[PDB]
Design a protein around this nucleic acid. Sequence first.
DNA 1: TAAACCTTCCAGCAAGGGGAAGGTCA
DNA 2: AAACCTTCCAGCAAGGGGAAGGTCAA
Lengths: 111, 111
Amino acid sequence: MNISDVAKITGLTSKAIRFYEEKGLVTPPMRSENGYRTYTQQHLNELTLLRQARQVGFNLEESGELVNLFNDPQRHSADVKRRTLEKVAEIERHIEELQSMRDQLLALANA
Amino acid sequence: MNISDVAKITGLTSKAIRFYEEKGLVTPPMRSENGYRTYTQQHLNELTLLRQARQVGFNLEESGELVNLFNDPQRHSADVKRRTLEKVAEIERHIEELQSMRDQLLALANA
DNA sequence: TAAACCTTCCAGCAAGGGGAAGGTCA
DNA sequence: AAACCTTCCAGCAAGGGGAAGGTCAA
């Protein structure tokens, strides 16, 4: 699997994906003999995750942290769990805000 | 009300507030004799909304569109109502994405 | 008069996207 | 030839940081 298919599957551009690799936000792809980046399922998981994170308001740094959370060898550790619930609470503050907006728009529409 | 006060109420920084003004995304504030920007309730309304939209991942164009809905002179019109419910669906799609990510994270946490 | 405001202007990081020049695939 | 891929060199852009200086207030 080459980069354009990965871009389609993940919701990213090819350019964003090379940029994310450059920044060390994702695990690097293997390269075939012709120099082509080639990808595995774990690369899809990471990039899809990054794209979703960015799409709901996380900056690049935070979105990388999310990816690292699922990559962490110490998955079951208190630390990983702490950093996870912290992302959970932020997301929950966003949902509360979106629902506040939702109500306001519906009140506008129902005037 | 001066800009730093607006900042504390809306959750934006002063620099962001002037920038949104510069981009014409919010109604300009008045200026007192000393040149200070001064703000009204309308401004607090726009800027909070803009802070909320950006916080959950909408870009500047989309966020500005949310603000224009509530500003529109043809408020009670069929046209505005249709466009409002249209934005409600986008916000609901956004809520669902956040809940989905929340769900993945909680699954990681309960591992 | 010393802090805590305020103003504008210029700088840098940020998060990428465009497009060129050249190599590869089927 | 179409449609891929590579690196490189650039823009654009949503800001934040900070200089330089005016204003407001005991």
